[PDB]
Every structure is written in C-alpha cells, then in structure tokens.
C-alpha cells in the first residue's frame, strides 16, 4: 500500500530519526548543490544589496532509506513531510533578511531515489548585501556574492560542494536595468573557522557588468551641455557687463543643481568615485568662466583682447584634453 | 486543473519598483475520485473552511510573486466545496505584488503585457496539469 509505503519509511513502525545526520559514526556528508535563479537583480546603491529569488537544489545520500517494495527508481513524495527527515543547515552569510514560501503548499520539493540518494529543492527570496568597490561607479564590474555555510555541524559532519557539470543555472529572459549577468561564474571554496571549529563554505561569484545607458543621457549629457554653454561667455560684446555676469553664476548654480541632482540614491561612502569627479571638474570649468572676466574687469583695451585671445579660441579647445583623458584610465 | 482567477483590486503599477499589487481569488477544480458517497443525496455541498489542510491540495505558486501571503482574517479565507462524485471546487484569496519586466521605449503610450505565471513545484507533469 502507498500508505504502508510511508509506514516503513517514516512514522512509528519505521524507527527513523530525523535528528541524526546520514552516515553517523563515520564519514561526513558531501552535498552536490546548485541554485536555480528566478528574479536576480534590484541592485541598490545606498542600501548596498540586491533582492534575488532562487530555487536551491541540493543532493546527498541518506543510506538508511533502502527499499525493495516498489520498483520505481525516481519517486516524488509529499512536499510537507520534509520536516520528518534530515535536512542540511545551510544559510547565507550576507542574507540580510530571508524567508520561506508557504504559498498554497510548502514550496519544498523532496525526491527520494531507490538507493537512498535524495533530491531536494526549496524556494528562497534573499536580499544579499555585497560590499561593492565603487572607485569607477559607471564602469564597475561588481562581483556580488552569496556564501552558503553550515552552522549546526562542523566539517567532520557535513561538506558543501558544487555540481561536477552545470553547477549554476540561470533562468532565461532575466534582463536587468543598468546590468547584464555575465555568463562565466567563478565557484570557489570559502571556508569559515569559528571558535566552535571548522565550518564548510561554498560561494558563487556574480560579476555585474554595469550597463552605463542610464548615466549617459541622464547624467553625462547635462554635464556635457552646460560646460560648452560657458563658451558663449567669451564671444559677446565687451560692453555687456551686466549681461555676461548673468551667464556663469546661474550655470554654476545649475551645475550645483546638477550636483545636488546627482546624489539622490547614492550611498554615503568615504572614498572618491569616478562619477563625482566628472561632476566636480565640470563644476570647475563653469566656475572658471567669470574670474577670467573678473581678471578682464581689472584690466578693463587690446590688452584685454590678448587675455581673451587665450580664452576665445584656446579655451574652447581646452575641454577635449580631459574627455579623452577620462575614458582611458577607469574603463577597466 | 481547470482554474481561473477572480480579481478584486488590480492595479498600483509601480514605475521604479516595476511591479503591481493585485488582490485575487483563485478558483480551481479537479477530481479526487476516492471521495464517493451515497449517504446524503445533496449534489453541491460546502464544508468547513479550515478542514482543507486535511485533504490534498495543488502546489501552485507564482513565478514573479515578489511577496505573498494568505488571509486568515476571522477565518481561513479558503473555500472548499465537494461535489457528489468527488469533484472539488476550491477557492482562496491571495494578495500578490507581481513584477513584470516592462518594455518602456514609449512610456506614455505603452501597452504593457504584465503577467502572472502559475506553476507547480512539488510535482512533475506526470502528476499534475494546470
């Protein structure tokens, strides 16, 4: 009977215990496992995290579950009887908040093979926090990670591993704003040693190649437009003394409005970026416009034309020297 | 499983968060043919809305659900109707915050096919069909 099948598996007559690891008084348990991502993304700037939805496949051997009653090799079971059997104690190091999904059923797959190998899969939503190096923020490749880790068992009881072939899966169609998920993924061995002892760790490496399509039109073009707007200060009549003063001061306030309109979702981090120094050097060039004319105002006739001769032609040639200089260094 | 949704408050489409909070009822029907009876001659017969955990249930979820929960307000809001032969009418109330990947090339004139995806998890296609 199918009712009598679980009577020999679990329950009273079985004598099974779920509180004991498999292969007790002996070898540890290696766990071949991988993640099935669903909605990766929502990378936050200030909060410095990302909300990911995954399934978590894992496999091991529980060799005290042999049976010769029903000849089926692969055999699914009840998705709520998983609390009546042994389970690994994995968590995530920078999980920052996580929960199950009991929507209409415990979303908790449990597949038992013929010999005692167990296929297992559960659905977990995370908000993993990655320490992100943001020296060149619009051109960064951020290896934001997760770290699986056992807690209630040491390394003489439980080992985490990856899969020998295909140790990570990406569900198709996952396209992201400002991001692409790079296909090659490093899967190395972290290891935790605590005061309790040796703990097994495994981790993934998600290289986030940032798509700069937002900050070009939104940030770079308003930084580009106002700098060349400062050049028409150096072409108007010299009797425009209340007129030239109305150009540079408003536009340096506009670049201050650009600078104040550039740090909304941005975190508060100590070290300097590449996105902000472009704002500052564009702030300095529009700052550079009127003290040229204030140096003219102490001179002010053709002598003042000489100091404008440096600025009427040479200064609009004095902007591309840094723009080419910008994209060479911090492109890697 | 023949099934459909009974939407209540569709909407609240977010721009930055890229989701929408919807309130639905979820009708579904199937056959449980080991529940035959000839005692009471009623064809349609409602039952206790809290005994549904004592019977079989499908394992549906939503792919881009982004956060969801039941509604135990004054009673498990969980309808359970059993026919005479063994067909089961079933209905529960679920609030979702479904996230749709929205193509926004023309944002003030877009037609956004924002979707939900029902999906079985603890059973393969040799066990359960939606």
């Amino acid at each position: 009977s199918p009712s009598d099948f679980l009577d020999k598996l679990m329950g009273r007559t079985s004598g099974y215990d779920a509180r004991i690891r498999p292969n007790f008084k002996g070898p540890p348990v290696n766990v071949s496992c991988n993640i099935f991502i669903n909605s990766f993304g929502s990378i936050a700037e200030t909060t410095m995290d990302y909300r990911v939805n995954i399934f978590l496949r894992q496999q091991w051997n529980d060799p005290r579950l042999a049976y010769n009653e029903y000849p089926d090799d692969s055999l699914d079971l009840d998705p709520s009887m998983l609390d009546s059997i042994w389970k690994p104690d994995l968590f995530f190091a920078n999980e920052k908040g996580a929960h199950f999904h009991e929507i209409t059923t415990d979303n908790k797959l449990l597949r038992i093979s013929r010999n005692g190998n167990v296929l297992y899969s559960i659905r977990i939503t995370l908000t993993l926090a990655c320490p992100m190096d943001l020296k060149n923020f619009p051109m960064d490749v951020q290896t934001c990670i997760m770290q699986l880790e056992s807690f209630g068992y040491t390394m003489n009881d439980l080992i985490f591993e990856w899969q020998e072939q295909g140790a990570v899966q990406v569900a198709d169609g996952l396209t992201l704003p400002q991001f692409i998920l790079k296909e090659e993924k490093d899967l190395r061995y972290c290891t935790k040693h605590y005061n309790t002892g040796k703990f097994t760790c495994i981790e993934a490496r998600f290289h986030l190649e940032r798509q700069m399509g937002y900050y070009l039109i939104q940030m770079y073009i308003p930084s580009l437009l106002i700098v060349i707007l400062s050049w028409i200060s150096f072409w108007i009549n010299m009797d425009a003394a209340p007129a030239r003063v109305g150009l540079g001061i408003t536009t340096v306030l506009t670049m201050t409005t650009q600078s104040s309109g550039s740090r909304a979702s941005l975190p508060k981090v100590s070290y300097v970026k590449a996105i902000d120094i472009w704002m500052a050097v564009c702030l300095l060039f529009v700052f550079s416009a009127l003290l040229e004319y204030a140096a003219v105002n102490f001179v002010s006739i053709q002598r003042a034309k000489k100091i404008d001769k440096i600025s009427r032609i040479g200064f609009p040639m004095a902007f591309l020297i840094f723009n080419m200089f910008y994209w060479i260094i911090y492109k890697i | 499983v023949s099934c459909n949704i009974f939407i209540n408050s569709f909407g609240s489409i977010a721009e930055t968060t890229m989701d929408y909070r919807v309130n639905i009822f979820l009708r579904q029907q199937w056959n449980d043919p080991r529940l035959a009876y000839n005692e009471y001659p009623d064809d349609s017969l409602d039952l206790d809305p809290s005994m549904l955990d004592s019977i079989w249930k499908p394992d549906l979820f939503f792919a881009n659900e982004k956060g969801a929960h039941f509604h135990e307000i004054t009673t498990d809001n969980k309808l359970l109707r059993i026919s005479r032969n063994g067909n089961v009418l079933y209905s529960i109330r679920i609030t979702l915050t479904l996230a749709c990947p929205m193509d926004l090339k023309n944002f003030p004139m877009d037609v956004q096919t924002c979707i939900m995806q029902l999906e079985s998890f603890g059973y393969t296609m040799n066990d359960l069909i939606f």
Partner: antibody
Amino acid sequence: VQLQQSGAELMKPGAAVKISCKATGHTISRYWIDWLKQRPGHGLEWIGEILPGSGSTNYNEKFKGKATFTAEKSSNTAYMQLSSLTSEDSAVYYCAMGVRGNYFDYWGQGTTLTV
Amino acid sequence: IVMTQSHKFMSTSVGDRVSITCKASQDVSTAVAWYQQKPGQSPKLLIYWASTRHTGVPGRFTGSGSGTDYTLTISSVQAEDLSLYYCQQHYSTPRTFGGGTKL
C-alpha cells in the same frame, strides 16, 4: 518553432562523430532536447536527454557511455557526440523536443548516418 | 521494461475498423503515446496520455485502454492512412517503444 540540423555524414567503424542541431525560434537552453535512434529494419530507439543550460543528462542503460551531450549557447545549437562506431550503429538520428511530457511533438528533419 | 505488440502488418480495406493491441511490461500508467511515421518523413504524434490529441490532428482517430491493455482504435480508414504505427510507455526513465506496425 522547428529545429534544424546540418548535412548528413559518413564514417568508418570504430570512429566518432558529433551531430549538430541548430535551433530556430527561441533559446534552446530553456527546453529539453532528446535523441532517438532509427536503425532501419528495426525501429526508433531513445538515447538520452539534455537541458542545454545545465547539461545534466540521463543516458540509457543500453546506451551507457554511448553518447556525449554538449551544447552551443553562442548560436543555439545542441551537440550529440558518439564513439566506437560498429555495424549495429548505422541509423537515423533525431533531435526532438517534447514539451508537455516525455513524449515528442517538435522535431528537426532527421539525419541518416551509416557506419 | 519490455513492450509487446501483436503484428507488424494487418490486411484491411479502406473505411474499416482497425485497432492496435499494444501491451507494456507492468502497470506503468495511462502514459501511452502513439507515433505514426510515413515513409520519407519523421514520426508524428497521434495520441498522448492514451486519450488526448495534437493541435492540427487527424480527428478520426481515437485512443482508449487502461491497466495492462491499451488500444489505438481506428474506425475510419482513408487513403492517406497507409503508414507505420508505434506504441510507447512514458511513465519511466527508459523510453521503451513498442514492436511497430505498418498498415
């Protein structure tokens, strides 16, 4: 949506060859790809399975160590590589794709190989 | 997992009743598939799960059978029906096909 294969080949006994399956319409790593062996005189004979995103397989008991399943995500192409060709292996092969179950409804066009 | 049909050929005329008596090894399921392969082209699905049909299917072909017996029932035979037939179990990991029957 229908699959596509390259031109049929011809080999000598004891050799090894790869069979390509170009996919037109979608990303082939989403769905399964299976393989069937049609030796004439006899009939069809299933080989294995591959999810091209994972490469996880279940080869047949009679076909243990027979086929090699790889995939090409750069152009949506599935690969089946054989080994140790004998006179029992002259057959017709198929890359199929059966969606709602273990049966088969989408196909390519067929490739005949003779040892 | 051994499949067993009855005949490779059955002689009949156009517009008759003809059925295929496939048989599986044990009671796998009602997971029974029927494949028709015309010469020169690919094998095509007829019936899956022993009762259902394809999109764009020949509608004059029916499926039945349960337990240890399964049947592709054809009560209407036309001129294009001269082809091959196969049965299948798909309730296991090996996909063991039937014996084969050309009309």
